[PDB]
Amino acid sequence: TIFEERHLKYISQLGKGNFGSVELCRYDPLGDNTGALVAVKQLQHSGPDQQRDFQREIQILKALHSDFIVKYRGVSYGPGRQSLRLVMEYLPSGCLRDFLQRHRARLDASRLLLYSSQICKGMEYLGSRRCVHRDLAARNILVESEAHVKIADFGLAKLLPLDKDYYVVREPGQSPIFWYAPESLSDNIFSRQSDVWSFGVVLYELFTYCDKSCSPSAEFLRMMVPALSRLLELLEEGQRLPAPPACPAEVHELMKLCWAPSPQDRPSFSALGPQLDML
Numbered sequence: 001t002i003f004e005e006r007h008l009k010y011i012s013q014l015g016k017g018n019f020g021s022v023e024l025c026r027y028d029p030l031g032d033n034t035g036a037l038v039a040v041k042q043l044q045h046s047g048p049d050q051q052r053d054f055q056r057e058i059q060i061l062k063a064l065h066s067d068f069i070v071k072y073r074g075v076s077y078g079p080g081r082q083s084l085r086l087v088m089e090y091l092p093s094g095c096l097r098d099f100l101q102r103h104r105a106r107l108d109a110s111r112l113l114l115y116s117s118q119i120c121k122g123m124e125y126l127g128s129r130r131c132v133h134r135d136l137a138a139r140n141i142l143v144e145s146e147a148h149v150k151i152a153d154f155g156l157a158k159l160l161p162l163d164k165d166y167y168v169v170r171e172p173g174q175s176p177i178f179w180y181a182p183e184s185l186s187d188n189i190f191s192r193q194s195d196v197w198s199f200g201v202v203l204y205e206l207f208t209y210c211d212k213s214c215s216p217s218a219e220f221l222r223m224m225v226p227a228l229s230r231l232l233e234l235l236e237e238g239q240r241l242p243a244p245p246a247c248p249a250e251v252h253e254l255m256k257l258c259w260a261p262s263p264q265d266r267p268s269f270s271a272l273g274p275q276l277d278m279l
C-alpha cells in the first residue's frame with residue numbers, strides 16, 4: 001500500500017473539487033507502459049489546513065470496505081510522515097453525471113433505481129462508520145460498470161464523535177448551494193440526516209439523467225436578497241424541485257420525504273434502502 005513517487009506516471013486529469021484533484025496515472029515500476037492504471041488524488045497546492053484535512057480524508061477512505069465505496073489502494077509520501085497522494089482504483093467509465101448524460105437513451109428506470117439502491121447502501125455503510133459525507137452529489141459517484149456505482153470522493157467527509165450526532169462548521173461552505181439541507185444553509189449544521197437531504201437531490205439528478213436544462217442549479221435559479229437567502233426562503237415556504245420529466249410517482253414521493261424540512265422527519269438510509277429495492 002506504499003506507492004513510490006518515481007513509478008507514478010502522469011497521464012490525464014480525471015476531476016477536481018475542494019482544493020484537490022484526481023489524476024489518471026499508470027503505476028509503472030517496469031517503465032514499459034504495462035503497469036496498472038490508478039486514480040491518484042492530491043492537493044492542487046500546499047496548504048497547512050488542507051494537509052491536515054487530507055490526512056484525515058485518507059484515514060477515512062482507508063477504513064472503508066464496501067462494494068459501494070471506491071477502493072483505497074494506498075498512499076505515496078514525500079517528507080515523512082507527509083502524505084503526498086491518495087491512490088485509488090481507476091474505473092474508466094468515470095463520473096456518474098457524465099455517464100448518465102451520455103448513456104441516457106440506453107438506461108431505463110430500473111437501472112436508475114439500481115444505482116439509487118447502491119448509493120443508498122454506500123451511505124448506510126458510511127453512517128454506520130459515524131461518517132458524514134457533506135458533499136453527496138452525482139459528481140462524486142463513480143461508475144464501475146453499467147450495473148454498479150460507487151461513492152468515490154470524501155474531500156469534505158467528517159467523523160462524528162461518539163457523543164454528538166452532528167458537526168457545525170464555522171464558516172459557510174463553498175459547494176454549490178443547491179444540494180444543501182436548510183439547516184446547513186441557515187446554520188452550517190451537517191449530519192447524516194443532511195446527507196439524506198442531499199441524497200434526495202441525487203435521486204433528482206439520476207431521474208433527470210443530470211440534464212443541464214433542469215439541473216438543481218438551473219431549476220432552483222429559475223424558481224428563485226442574496227441567492228442563499230432566496231433559496232432558504234424558497235425552501236422554508238415548502239417549495240421543492242419539481243418531479244423530473246417522466247419520474248415514477250413513487251420515486252418523486254421518496255425525494256419529497258428526503259426533503260422534509262426538519263432533519264428528524266427525513267427517513268434513514270436504513271429505511272430508504274428496502275423501499276428502493278422494492279421499486
Ligand SMILES: C[C@@H]1CCN(C(=O)CC#N)C[C@@H]1N(C)c1ncnc2[nH]ccc12
Nearest residue numbers: 015016017020021022039090091152153
Ligand atoms: C468521480 C470521481 C470522484 C470525484 N472526482 C474528483 O476528481 C474529485 C476531486 N478532487 C472525479 C473522480 N473520477 C472521475 C474518477 N474516475 C475514475 N477513477 C476514479 N477513481 C477514483 C475517482 C475516479
